Structures are given as C-alpha cells and as structure tokens.
Amino acid sequence: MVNAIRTPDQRFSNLDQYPFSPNYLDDLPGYPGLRAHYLDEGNSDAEDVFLCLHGEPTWSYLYRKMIPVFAESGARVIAPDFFGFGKSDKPVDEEDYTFEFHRNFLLALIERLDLRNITLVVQDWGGFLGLTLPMADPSRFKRLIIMNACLMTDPVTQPAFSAFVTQPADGFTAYKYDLVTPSDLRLDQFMKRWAPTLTEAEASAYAAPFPDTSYQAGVRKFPKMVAQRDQACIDISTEAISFWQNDWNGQTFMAIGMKDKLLGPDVMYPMKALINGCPEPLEIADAGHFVQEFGEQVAREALKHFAETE
C-alpha cells in the first residue's frame, strides 16, 4: 500500500528565485505515509486565498513569479506539489497514479487546511483536476484564473478536448513522446525545449525533484492519462462542464499562451464558452504552454480585473 520515495532535501538547496518556506501535511485522509509539500505565503488570516495548481511535468516552482504578486495584494497563497512532484513524496508505481488519486488529494488538502474564498489558479493538469473541484464544495470557491487547460471528458462530448492529442505531430504527440520514451528522462532539457525562455538555472529547478528515473513514475503517468481517460475521469470531467455552464457565478479571468501547440486557442475558446461569465481572454503572444513563466503579467491583470468587478 503505496510504496513511495522522498527526494533528498539537498536537491533543493540551490533553487533559483524560490525563497518560499516549506510546509508539509503528513497522512492526509487516504494518503497514509505520504508527505505532501505546499507553500503558504502571504497573510495566513487573509480573506482571499489563491489556490495555485501546477501541471506536467512541473511543481509549485512554476508559480514562483505569480506568488509574490498575489501575496502583495493582501491575499494568502497555497501552492501544493502533487504526489510524485516537487517536494511531496513520490509513489514508485505508475499504477498508483490516477485521476482520482490526484483529485481526492486536492480535496483532502482543501478540507484539512479549511480553505475558503478561494481563487482557483490552474493550467494543464492543475486545470484538468482543478476545474473539477468546485462542484464538490461550491461555497468554498469564489474566483477562477484559467490558463491553457480544459476538461478530460470524452471525444464525442467535446471533440476540441481530444483532437489536440493526435494533432499536430509536434504538439501533444511530441510532448508525450519526450516524457514517456527516454530511459533517462532529463526534465531540465525537456523544459528548455517546451519553455525556450527559461534560464539554465530555472531549468535546473525542474530537474531538481528527480535524482533518477525511479522518482519519475508520476511524470510518466500524467501524459498517458491524457490519452487514455478512465471512466471516473470522463464522468467527473463531464459533470464539471455542467457546473461551469449552469452553476458557476464567480469572477473569472482567462489567459492564453498563444504559442502553445497543445492547449492554445483550439482548446481555450471552447473552454471560455463553457464557463459562465468568462470574459474575453488575455492573449499572450509570446507565452507557450507554461503561461506561468509570463505570470507576473497574468497575476497583475487578474487582480486588476477582479477589483473592477468587486
């Protein structure tokens, strides 16, 4: 029952621009023996809380440029590392990672920390999973900041959320290929390719959580879950659509990384239509899949947009 390993702390000693202190939650309901890492920045008694969820194959380090902007506005910021990523523990078997394994973890984190007045900030898997959280506990969610992401429903229901899987060849097909094929996966090399504006140091931070391949079962399972969606993922994702379309009435802000070959306009415009009240998206011409690397701007504009609608 959940064989996992922990990344030696020395691997995080020379992180670039990541002065955020570690917080851990051991033995969350349904996660015995697993220690989860998360950042808790800004006023801990703040009324507003920004839940920042990362994706594949990154960690909370991805939100490092957005965190300060949010904390400065007077809000609290929670940025958790999924099991298998960042400083959280990493199950050694790919079988242990599932849509509900990661989803239930997010729900347990929300209940444990008793988060309220939440502004959900998502991208990629943070969105696939994150966008399904509100419907399970609506009163806790207030706003949404969505960057390149969608819902993992079936091809018939939403063809746009499946089409990108097979085309273009240099889009998700290439992304997935780079992650599931190399016997010796080097995430610093991966991130420099998929986020060409990263410095050598920043790229090193993405490799930091993984001393060797045995620490990458979670990294290898995520892309596979996008291509092969189980029934639970499909149903949860389909129920999520109805929520964003008929139940959601909170403030929303969308930003599109225009150079994203995976989840750009093809996926983001159909998403905008599904989220009730979603305004015209902020198009970021230079941004890639990892919109957060251009996050200071997204952070500032999201706060400005939220204030004008208070």
From Swiss-Prot:
SUPFAM superfamilies the record matches: alpha/beta-Hydrolases (SSF53474)
GO biological process: 1,2-dichloroethane catabolic process; response to toxic substance
Keyword flag Ribonucleoprotein: no
Entry annotation: catalytic residues: 124, 260, 289
Keywords: Detoxification, Hydrolase
Pathway(s) the chain acts in: Xenobiotic degradation; 1,2-dichloroethane degradation; glycolate from 1,2-dichloroethane: step 1/4
AB hydrolase-1 domain span: 49-295
Keyword Hydrolase belongs to the record: yes
Top-level enzyme category: hydrolase
A single GO molecular function term of this UniProt record: epoxide hydrolase activity
Biophysicochemical property: pH dependence: Optimum pH is 8.2.
Enzyme Commission number: 3.8.1.5
Function in brief: Catalyzes hydrolytic cleavage of carbon-halogen bonds in halogenated aliphatic compounds, leading to the formation of the corresponding primary alcohols, halide ions and protons. Has a broad substrate specificity, which includes terminally mono- and di- chlorinated and brominated alkanes (up to C4 only). The highest activity was found with 1,2-dichloroethane, 1,3-dichloropropane, and 1,2-dibromoethane.
Entry similarity comment: Belongs to the haloalkane dehalogenase family. Type 1 subfamily.
The protein, known as: Haloalkane dehalogenase
Organism in which the protein naturally occurs: Xanthobacter autotrophicus
